[PDB]
Design brief:
With 49 residues, the chain is an all-alpha fold. The chain contains 2 helices and no strands. It is elongated. The protein binds one DNA strand of 81 nucleotides through α1. This is Chromo domain-containing protein 1. It is found in: Nucleus. Belongs to the SNF2/RAD54 helicase family.
Length: 49
DNA sequence: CGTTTAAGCGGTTGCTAGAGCTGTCTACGACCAATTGAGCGGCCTCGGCACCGGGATTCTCCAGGGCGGCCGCGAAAAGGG
């Protein structure tokens, strides 16, 4: 995730696109909600109906 | 300890049960008065068990009649002087 993971400060990102599923969104919402996302793409949006 | 499997969580999709609210009404139960008949106590009487007097029935005992054994006793046959 982090370009500088050993630093104690605000760590910048290293990746560009993160592919995930719904289960790990509901499992790791605390570790993924504190990221300033620029774009979001949700496949099979009828699950979000 | 290795492996499988089913619990846990999230999700669909419609209908129905049930809680809550508002409204109406009707049968049902509280209430009261008059009444009376079912419950509690006593009083009287019979069914059955028991007590007492009287009469019929069977078992035990005392006395009479007959028979056996003794007690010397006494008439009689045989021996002796």
């Amino acid at each position: 995730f982090y370009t500088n993971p050993r630093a104690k400060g605000k760590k910048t990102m290293k990746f560009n696109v993160l592919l995930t599923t719904y289960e790990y969104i509901l499992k790791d919402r605390a570790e993924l909600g504190s990221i300033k996302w620029q774009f979001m793409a949700v496949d099979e949006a009828h699950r979000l109906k």
